[PDB]
Design a protein around this ligand. Sequence first.
Ligand SMILES: Nc1ncnc2[nH]cnc12
Lengths: 113, 39
Amino acid sequence: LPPEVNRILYIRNLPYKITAEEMYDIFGKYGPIRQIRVGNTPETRGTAYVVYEDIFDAKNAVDHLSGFNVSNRYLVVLYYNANRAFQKMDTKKKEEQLKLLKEKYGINTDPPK
Amino acid sequence: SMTPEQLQAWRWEREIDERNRPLSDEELDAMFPEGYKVL
Ligand SMILES: Nc1ncnc2[nH]cnc12
């Protein structure tokens, strides 16, 4: 599996009123879910992070859920990218966040491919 | 003794294991920006 494959999926175009149970039904179909974080601010609502326990389940969800129809709306389902994840920070404070993550955990801090 | 091909399989298994290790809650939390609620 390609390097960009990750157990964390970043979701966009998510209905505002979707429930915790609906989130677990949609994504849980693909394997044990480690955790889900739903955006709950003006800047983040409509988006979510979905974490799988296993990487091959995460690959499978991407292959099947991109453009998935839920309440007249097609989901955008993307692999986590730390660079992307911390976009909404300023130049200096972002660089430090990415530095922390690469140093302490060894995650890729490059932009998407 | 493993052939070049079997070595490459062994290598993928190792790489794949490193990418499928369990994460602490501390590691996980570090991964995410503000404005998200844990379900
Ligand atoms: N691929 C991605 N991963 C994480 N957060 C993001 N924000 C925008 N794109 C992202």
